[PDB]
Structure 1
Amino acid sequence: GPLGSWVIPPISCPENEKGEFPKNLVQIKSNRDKETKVFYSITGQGADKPPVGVFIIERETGWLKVTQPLDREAIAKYILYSHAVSSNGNAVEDPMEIVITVTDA
């Protein structure tokens, strides 16, 4: 089913964060990494679509980060999709819908 071998914690981010960016949110992982090298990407509005690069993921490690302060009042919720592919580019998982909620903070 859609879960496949994904291991993903719930994702929430306080608005108006200060200090240094980027900031680690969660690590995304597929257990398909036991048999093959897995490469991670995220798609959606706030990732590869406007506003682009608000959220980024490390391709090899799966660390999902935020790059700037958020404003719940402007955007309360982001809908993204995590992807997992092998060295050949073929998907080892079905894209998992990831929901990022913005909180107060």
Structure 2
Amino acid sequence: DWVVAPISVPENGKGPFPQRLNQLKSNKDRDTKIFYSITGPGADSPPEGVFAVEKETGWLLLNKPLDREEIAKYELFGHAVSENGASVEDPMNISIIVTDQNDHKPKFTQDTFRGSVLEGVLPGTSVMQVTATDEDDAIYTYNGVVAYSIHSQEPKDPHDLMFTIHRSTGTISVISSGLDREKVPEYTLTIQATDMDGDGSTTTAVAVVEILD
């Protein structure tokens, strides 16, 4: 059968609402009067009334701006019904895909993360993992794609770059020899998490590393 292609609707649209997405039509309408309707989540089950059809004209309408982070996709059936009350067609699948906007910044799961590591480890040893989440899409776009970096280390003894952080996983690793509890018992790493794979918004948190024995 000929069917509606999936309609892409960006989230957070400016209107005007209700907004026309597509006009539903059965050719049998030259022969008798046709009444259009839609079913499914978004239509007549929760969340109800997000979409509507104009029963005479067949206009599918979006009633309000959409949020991808709430529902990413709607699937409905359009129904064509005679003046009598009989179905004049098989129901037609209607797909609405909500495309993503970068409308969320990265949030660290806490403000300070505490970890520890033994005082004699060789470059290339995991210490701890920090996490920042972004609620936007990471599959089709970079909006939800977080890049981690160390902004600074305090203090700079024995020298500055003692640690590294995995850009995708926020795993912090020792990368230089020379950790010693007697000299330096604790480091503070200022961490950044930047969405759009490091081109979007930056958020900052802190990682405190205890040097053990």
* Contact residue 7 and residue 31 of structure 1 kept, 8 A: no
What TM-score results when the alignment is normalised by the length of structure 1? Answer: 0.88
Change (3 A) 1:64 1:58: same
Residue among 56, 69, 74 paired with 1:73: 69
- Calculate the aligned-residue CA RMSD, in Å: 1.5
Instruction: Check if 1:96 corresponds to 2:111.
Output: no
Matches within 5 A, 1:32-51: 32-51=28-47
* Contact residue 3 and residue 92 of structure 2 kept, 8 A: no
Q: CA deviation at 1:61?
A: 0.5
What TM-score results when the alignment is normalised by the length of structure 2? Answer: 0.45
Q: CA deviation at 1:98?
A: 1.1
Unaligned segments of structure 2, at least 5 residues: 102-213
* Contact residue 19 and residue 62 of structure 2 kept, 8 A: yes
Q: CA deviation at 1:71?
A: 1.1
Q: Residues of 2 paired with 1:10 and 1:50: CA distance?
A: 21
Q: Percent identity?
A: 65
Q: Residues of 2 paired with 1:19 and 1:8: CA distance?
A: 22
User: What is the aligned residue count?
Assistant: 101
* Equivalence for 1:15: 11
Q: CA deviation at 1:20?
A: 3.0
Q: Residues of 1 paired with 2:91 and 2:64: CA distance?
A: 25
Q: Which amino acid aligns with 1:57?
A: V
Q: CA deviation at 1:104?
A: 3.2
* Equivalence for 1:30: 26
Q: Residues of 2 paired with 1:62 and 1:35: CA distance?
A: 16
Q: Which amino acid aligns with 1:17?
A: G
Q: Which runs of 4+ in 1 moved over 6 A?
A: none
* Equivalence for 2:204: none
Q: Residues of 1 paired with 2:28 and 2:5: CA distance?
A: 17
Unaligned segments of structure 1, at least 5 residues: none
Q: Residues of 2 paired with 1:19 and 1:43: CA distance?
A: 23
Q: CA deviation at 1:8?
A: 3.4
More displaced, 29-38 or 41-50?
Answer: 29-38
Higher-Rg member (1/2): 2
